[PDB]
Design a protein around this ligand. Structure first.
Ligand SMILES: CCCCCCCCCCCCCCCC(=O)O
Ligand SMILES: CCCCCCCCCCCCCCCC(=O)O
Lengths: 129, 129
C-alpha cells in the first residue's frame, strides 16, 4: 500500500551490462558493481521522494505520479518523463530506450529496467524499523 | 563498543566550505549538499569496512587500525595513511592537511573533519534493524 521505506539491496542482475549500455566508463562500473547500499523512498499519496543509491552514485529524484517530471539518470542526463502508479504497488515509466518497473510485494522491491536485450533487475528488502 | 551498523545522516555543518577547500567540482557540491543518506560500517576487531555515502558519492574503504592503509577520499584521490583507535570510541586519521575523528556515542556517530579553519561535522543515527 505504501512504498515508504529504507531498502537494502539484496541482489542484482546485469548491472555491468546495463551501465555499459548507457555509456558509463568501465573503470566506474567496476568500482560500483559490488556495492549493496540502501535506497530510500518517502511516499505521500501520489508524491514520491527517492534517494537512490546505485553503484558509486546517489541520485535524489522527486515526482508526483501522473505529472511530467525531470528525473536525473545514471548518465547525469535529466530526462523529461511521467511516472505512473499501476494498482497501489507498481511504478512504471519509460525514458530514452529504457522501460522501468518498480514493484513492491510485501517488503521486497523488484526494480526491472529493460534496455534492448538487457534486463537489469534489482531486488531490495525494506529495513524493518 | 562496536561501530558496526547502518547510520542515517541527520545533520551536517560546513559541507560546502569543506568540499570547496578540497576542490570538489561545484556541480557536485550543489547536487550533494542536501542529500542525507545511509553509511555502513562493518567492524571485526581492528578491521573496518566502510561504505560511506557523502553527497552524491558512495565511497568504499577498508582498513585495519594501526596498519598503513590506502584510502579513497572524497575527490577520488587515494591517500596512504594510518587510522588509530583513540580512547576506545574514536577512530582518528590525518591525511594531507585534514584531521578526521569518528566518534561513537551509543546510537550516534559524529564525524569531525578539520581542515585549517573549517570544521566539517556530520551527525548520524543508527538504523534500528
Ligand atoms: C529514471 C529513474 C532513476 C534512474 C536511476 C537508475 C539506477 C537504478 C534505479 C533503481 C532504483 C529503483 C528504486 C528501488 C531501490 C533500489 O533498487 O535501489
Ligand atoms: C578517509 C576518507 C573519508 C571519506 C571522504 C568523505 C567525507 C565523509 C566521511 C564521513 C564518514 C564517516 C562514517 C560515519 C558516517 C557518515 O558520517 O556518513
Amino acid at each position: 500500500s505504501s512504498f515508504s521505506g529504507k531498502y537494502q539491496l539484496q541482489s542484482q542482475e546485469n548491472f555491468e551490462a546495463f551501465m555499459k549500455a548507457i555509456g558509463l566508463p568501465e573503470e566506474l562500473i567496476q568500482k560500483g558493481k559490488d556495492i549493496k547500499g540502501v535506497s530510500e523512498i518517502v511516499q505521500n499519496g501520489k508524491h514520491f521522494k527517492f534517494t537512490i543509491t546505485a553503484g558509486s552514485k546517489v541520485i535524489q529524484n522527486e515526482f508526483t505520479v501522473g505529472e511530467e517530471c525531470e528525473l536525473e539518470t545514471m548518465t547525469g542526463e535529466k530526462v523529461k518523463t511521467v511516472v505512473q502508479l499501476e494498482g497501489d504497488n507498481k511504478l512504471v515509466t519509460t525514458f530514452k530506450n529504457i522501460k522501468s518497473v518498480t514493484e513492491l510485494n510485501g517488503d521486497i522491491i523488484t526494480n526491472t529496467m529493460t534496455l534492448g536485450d538487457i534486463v537489469f533487475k534489482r531486488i531490495s528488502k525494506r529495513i524493518l524499523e
